[PDB]
Amino acid sequence: MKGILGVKVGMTRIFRDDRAVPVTVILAGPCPVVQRRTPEKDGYTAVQLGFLPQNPKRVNRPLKGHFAKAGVEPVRILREIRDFNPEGDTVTVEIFKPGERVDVTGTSKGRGFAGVMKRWNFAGGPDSHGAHKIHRHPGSIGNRKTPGRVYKGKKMAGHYGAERVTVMNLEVVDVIPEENLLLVKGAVPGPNGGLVIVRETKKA
Amino acid sequence: MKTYVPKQVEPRWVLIDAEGKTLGRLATKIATLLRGKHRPDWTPNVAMGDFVVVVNADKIRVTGKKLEQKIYTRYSGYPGGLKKIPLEKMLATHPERVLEHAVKGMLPKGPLGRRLFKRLKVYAGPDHPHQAQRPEKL
Amino acid sequence: KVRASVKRICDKCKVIRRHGRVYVICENPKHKQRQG
Amino acid sequence: PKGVSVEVAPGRVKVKGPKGELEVPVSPEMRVVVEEGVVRVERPSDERRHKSLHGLTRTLIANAVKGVSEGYSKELLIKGIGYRARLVGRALELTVGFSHPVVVEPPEGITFEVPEPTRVRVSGIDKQKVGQVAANIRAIRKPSAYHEKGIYYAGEPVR
RNA sequence: CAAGUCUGGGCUAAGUGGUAAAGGAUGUGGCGCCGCGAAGACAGCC
RNA sequence: UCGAUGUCGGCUCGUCGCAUCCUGGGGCUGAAGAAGGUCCCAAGGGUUGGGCUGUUCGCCCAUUAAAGCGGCACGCGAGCU
RNA sequence: CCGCUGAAAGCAUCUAAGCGGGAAGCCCGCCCCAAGAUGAGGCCUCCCACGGCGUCAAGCCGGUAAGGACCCGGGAAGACC
Numbered sequence: 001m002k003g004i005l006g007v008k009v010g011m012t013r014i015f016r017d018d019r020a021v022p023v024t025v026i027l028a029g030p031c032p033v034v035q036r037r038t039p040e041k042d043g044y045t046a047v048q049l050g051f052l053p054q055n056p057k058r059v060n061r062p063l064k065g066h067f068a069k070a071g072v073e074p075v076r077i078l079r080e081i082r083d084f085n086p087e088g089d090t091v092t093v094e095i096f097k098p099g100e101r102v103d104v105t106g107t108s109k110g111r112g113f114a115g116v117m118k119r120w121n122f123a124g125g126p127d128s129h130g131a132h133k134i135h136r137h138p139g140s141i142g143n144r145k146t147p148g149r150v151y152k153g154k155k156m157a158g159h160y161g162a163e164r165v166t167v168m169n170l171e172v173v174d175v176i177p178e179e180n181l182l183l184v185k186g187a188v189p190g191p192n193g194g195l196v197i198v199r200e201t202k203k204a
Numbered sequence: 205m206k207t208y209v210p211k212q213v214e215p216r217w218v219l220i221d222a223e224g225k226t227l228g229r230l231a232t233k234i235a236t237l238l239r240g241k242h243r244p245d246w247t248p249n250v251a252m253g254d255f256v257v258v259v260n261a262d263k264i265r266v267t268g269k270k271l272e273q274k275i276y277t278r279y280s281g282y283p284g285g286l287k288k289i290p291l292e293k294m295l296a297t298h299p300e301r302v303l304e305h306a307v308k309g310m311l312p313k314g315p316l317g318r319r320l321f322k323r324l325k326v327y328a329g330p331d332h333p334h335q336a337q338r339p340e341k342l
Numbered sequence: 343k344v345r346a347s348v349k350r351i352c353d354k355c356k357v358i359r360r361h362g363r364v365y366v367i368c369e370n371p372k373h374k375q376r377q378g
Numbered sequence: 379p380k381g382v383s384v385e386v387a388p389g390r391v392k393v394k395g396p397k398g399e400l401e402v403p404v405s406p407e408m409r410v411v412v413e414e415g416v417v418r419v420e421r422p423s424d425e426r427r428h429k430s431l432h433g434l435t436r437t438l439i440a441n442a443v444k445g446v447s448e449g450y451s452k453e454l455l456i457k458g459i460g461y462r463a464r465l466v467g468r469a470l471e472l473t474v475g476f477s478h479p480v481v482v483e484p485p486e487g488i489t490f491e492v493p494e495p496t497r498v499r500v501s502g503i504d505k506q507k508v509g510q511v512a513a514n515i516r517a518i519r520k521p522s523a524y525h526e527k528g529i530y531y532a533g534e535p536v537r
Numbered sequence: 538c539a540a541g542u543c544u545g546g547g548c549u550a551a552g553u554g555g556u557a558a559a560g561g562a563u564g565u566g567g568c569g570c571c572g573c574g575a576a577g578a579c580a581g582c583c
Numbered sequence: 584u585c586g587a588u589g590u591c592g593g594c595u596c597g598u599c600g601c602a603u604c605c606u607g608g609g610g611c612u613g614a615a616g617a618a619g620g621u622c623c624c625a626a627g628g629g630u631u632g633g634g635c636u637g638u639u640c641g642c643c644c645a646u647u648a649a650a651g652c653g654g655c656a657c658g659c660g661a662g663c664u
Numbered sequence: 665c666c667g668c669u670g671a672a673a674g675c676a677u678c679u680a681a682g683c684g685g686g687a688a689g690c691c692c693g694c695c696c697c698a699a700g701a702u703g704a705g706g707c708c709u710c711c712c713a714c715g716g717c718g719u720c721a722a723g724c725c726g727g728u729a730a731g732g733a734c735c736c737g738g739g740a741a742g743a744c745c
Contacts, residue, residue: 035708042707061710061730103695110741116596123595130594130664139595140659145588147655151598152281162741166695191740202694232542268552283598293691312538322703343611343622347561357562358677362551364562367677371611377561378623405681426565430672430680437670438681510668510684517667517685524615 003081003199004028004091005051006182008106010192014173014183022186023173026104028198029053029180031091032069034078047084049091051195052076076195093175093182100172101201106190110162119160165189169201210245213252215323219338220256221330223263230264231306238311238320251316255323257338259330262299266291276305299328348375379416382446384439386411391439395446398487398503402442405431417443441505450489450501452508454515457496458527461519465492472498474519474529482515 006028013022031049039045052075062073069090096102116138117124125134138157141150166189173183188196218237222230236242240252266274274291294302303326311317325332332338348366350357355368366375382395391402391410404410407428410419417439421432441449456463456472463472466481470490473479484490488511489501498515502508512531521528525535 037707044706048708062708064709066709112742125595125663132663134595134663137595137662139597139662141596141662143598143655143658145656146658147598151283152285153283155596159742164696168695194740229542268550270552273552289691345561346559349561356676359562359564360677360679364564366562374611376610376623403682426672427680428672432671433673434671434681441669504669506669506683508668513667513684 001081001083001200002095003084003197004093004095005031005049005076005079006196006198007052007076008188008190008192008194008196011186013186016173021173023183024186024188026182026184026188026196026198027180028093028182032067032071032074033086033088033091034064034067034069034073036085036088037080044082045085046080046082047086048078048080050074050078079197081197081199092177093180094177096172096175096182098172098174101203102170102172102184103166103168103199103201104170104184104188104196105164105166105199106188106194106196108161108163108165108189109191111160113158114160116155116157119157120155122155169203208245210247210250210252213240213243213245215252216254216339217337218254218256219332219340220258221260221263222342223260224265227264227266227303227306231303231310234258234303234307234324235310238307238323249316251319251323253320253323255325257325257327257332257334258303259327259332261303261326262295262328264303271295300326343374344376344378346377348377351375379443379447382443384412384417384443391442393439393442393446395443397446397448400442400445400503402435402438404435404438407431408435410435445503445505449503449505450508451499452502452512453497453499453532454512455497455530455532456528457521457530461527461529462495463492463498464495465490470498470515472515472518472529475527476519480518482518485511 006026009025009027011022011024013020015021029051031051033047034050035048037044037046037048050069050073053071055072055075057072059073064070064073111118115136116122117136122138124136125139127135138155141154141156167187170188171185173185175182182198190196220230220234234256237254237256239248240246240250240254243252245252271292272290276289276291276294278287278289279285280287291302304324307324308321311321325334327333348357348364350366351373352368352370354370355366355373358365358367364377366373368374382393384394385392389404389406391404393400393402407422408419408431410417419432419436419439421428456474458475461472461474463470468484468489470482470484470492471479472482482490485507487503488507491499491501493499500508500512500515502511516529516531519528521530521535525537
C-alpha cells in the first residue's frame with residue numbers, strides 16, 4: 001500500500017484530450033521515513049513518515065535522531081502508512097504515475113454547532129401556513145409511552161465537520177517530480193494549506 | 205459466639221485443563237474454586253478464592269449440536285443492535301471467551317462477583333504466561 | 343408442494359424424511375411435496 | 379481381489395492397487411483387519427445405528443477396491459445441433475450454445491477423454507469424484523428443453 | 538443458591554423439555570395377533 | 584386513569600414486524616421462446632409527482648422495477664398545524 | 665432449492681457416515697468512532713535521584729528534571745471550554 005504525507009494547496013482545471021478537468025493540486029514534499037514498524041516488535045508493519053521540514057530545533061523529548069534522516073523532525077509531525085515498506089531513505093512523488101488511482105484523507109471544514117437540516121438535510125418546518133417558531137426545527141423525535149425514550153444515534157444538532165474524511169479512488173492526472181507536486185480529480189477534504197494523506201486506492 | 209472469620213488468606217494458584225471436557229461441567233467447578241468454597245473458611249463477604257488458570261481452552265467438548273445452535277448475544281445500545289453469533293464462531297475466534305462467559309454467569313452478580321471473575325485466567329493453548337506456582341488439579 | 347397434509351398421490355410417489363422434514367417424491371414432478 | 383492390497387488402521391482403511399491407493403474412512407463399530415483371500419465386515423449390537431453402518435461400510439470399501447483395479451468408467455452424450463466438445467491439455471472446452479464456450483479444468487486423479495466430438499467420458503480411481511464431476515458437467519447444460527439439446531448420461535428422456 | 542454433579546431401571550436426540558389444534562409422517566422404543574416361507578419371489582436382471 | 588392519560592387527519596422525524604409491492608435466490612406450471620400463474624427462501628436497499636375530499640381510505644391523471652400491508656397511546660400538539 | 669457417493673430396507677432414497685453446488689440475505693472485506701477495552705494494551709524517544717523528617721518511600725514537605733501550565737498574538741478550530 002503506497003502512500004505519502006502531503007498538503008492540499010488548492011485547485012484549478014486543466015485541459016486533457018480536449019476537455020476541462022478540474023484538479024486539486026497537492027504538494028507531497030519528500031517524506032523522510034523516520035521509523036519502521038515491524039511485526040516482530042510492534043505487531044503489525046507500517047512506515048512512519050515525516051513531512052513539513054523546517055524546525056528551530058524544537059526537539060526536546062523526541063530528539064529521536066535514531067534514524068538517519070532525523071533531519072530535524074517535521075513541523076507537521078509524522079504519520080504511519082499501514083502496510084508499506086520501501087527504499088528506506090525518503091518517499092518522493094515518483095511513487096505515483098499518471099493514470100493511477102488513489103484514496104485521499106484529510107480534515108473536513110469545521111462547521112461548528114450545525115443545525116440539523118445542515119448536519120443532516122432534515123426537512124425543516126414550513127416557511128408559512130403553520131405557526132412560526134419551528135421553521136428550522138427537527139419535528140418529532142419519538143413515539144410515546146413505548147419506548148418512552150429516544151434511541152441511540154438520533155440525528156440531531158451539534159459540532160459538525162472538522163473531522164477526518166477519506167474520499168476514494170481519485171485519478172492522478174499528473175505528477176511534477178521537479179516540484180513534489182501532484183494533480184488529482186479535484187475535491188479533496190479540507191481547506192487549502194491543510195494536511196492530507198494520499199494512498200493507493202481500493203478498487204483492488 | 206465465635207467469629208471464626210479469617211485474617212487475609214494466602215491465595216492459591218491452580219492450573220486446570222481437561223481439554224476434552226464439557227464446558228459448564230468444567231465451568232461449574234471453576235466457579236466453586238473462585239469463591240473460597242471448597243475451603244472451610246468460606247467467607248461470603250471477602251474473596252478468599254483461588255486463582256484459576258485454564259490452559260488449552262478451545263478443545264472444550266460440548267454435547268448435542270451446539271455449534272450454529274448455541275447463540276451468544278450482544279445488544280449495542282442502538283436500533284437494530286442485536287448481534288447473534290454461533291458458538292462455532294466464538295471458538296473460531298475468541299475461543300478463550302467461550303469458557304469465560306459460561307463461568308461468569310455462574311458467579312454472583314455484585315462487585316465481589318466481578319472481582320472474583322478477574323481471578324480466573326483463561327488461555328487457548330497450552331502455555332500459561334505466568335509462572336507463579338500452579339498445583340495442577342485433575 | 344408446501345402443505346401440512348402431505349400424502350402419497352399415486353403408487354410411484356414416495357415418502358422421505360430428510361433433514362428434519364417430511365418430503366414426498368414421485369416419478370412425475372407435479373407430485374413433489376414438502377411438509378410445512 | 380488380486381494385485382490389490384488392504385491394510386487397516388483405526389478409523390481408516392487403506393486400499394492399494396494397480397491404478398492407485400485410496401483411504402476409506404470407517405466406523406469403529408467394527409473389528410476389521412485384513413481377512414482371508416477376501417475382506418469381510420461385521421457389526422456389534424444389532425441396533426439402528428450399527429445395522430445402517432454395516433453394509434454402508436461394506437460398500438464404501440467395495441467401491442474402493444474396484445477403483446484401484448480400474449473403475450474409471452462413466453460417459454456423457456452431448457445432443458443438439460451446434461454443441462460439441464474438444465480436449466485441451468487435460469481440460470474440456472465444451473461449447474453448448476452459450477455465447478462463449480465453457481472450459482472445465484480437471485480435478486486431481488481424473489481424466490477426461492474426447493473420443494467423438496459428442497461423447498465424453500470421465501476416468502478416475504475413485505467414484506465419488508467421478509460421479510460428482512460428471513454432474514458438474516451435466517449441470518453446465520442439463521437437458522429437458524421440451525426435448526433434445528443439452529448433455530445427457532446414458533440415461534434417457536421422456537416426451 | 539442452603540442441601541446429592543446420590544443409587545437402580547427405562548425412554549428421548551427435538552435444547553423436545555423451555556407452555557397450542559384439526560390434521561399429516563418407512564421418527565423412535567415396548568407390548569399384542571394374524572398372513573404365510575426346501576406347493577423354497579418379499580426386493581432385485583429373461 | 585374524571586384533585587384531567589389533549590381525543591381525527593396533515594406535517595416533521597423516524598424505528599420495528601413479515602403475512603413481500605419492487606429488486607436477489609428457487610420448485611411446480613395447463614412452462615415452446617418472450618411474458619405470466621402459483622407456491623417456497625429472502626426486508627439489504629427501494630417503494631414517485633399531481634387532480635378531488637379536512638379526510639383515513641378511495642377513485643382518477645402521468646409515470647414507475649415497484650407504486651406492499653401493518654405496529655410504535657388509530658407512533659409523534661411540553662415539535663408545528 | 666439441486667446434486668455426488670450411500671445403508672438401515674438385496675430395490676429405492678441429497679442422509680442415517682461422509683462430499684459438492686446454491687440468494688440484493690448472514691460473516692469478513694470498504695468508510696468513520698474507538699483502551700474509562702478500570703480486561704485502562706503496544707512501540708519510539710526522553711528525565712532521573714534522599715536534599716529533611718514519621719510507625720520508614722510519602723501516607724514527606726521544600727526546591728527540581730524531562731516536560732507542562734498560566735499571560736499574550738492569532739486560526740477555513742470554536743457558544744464557553
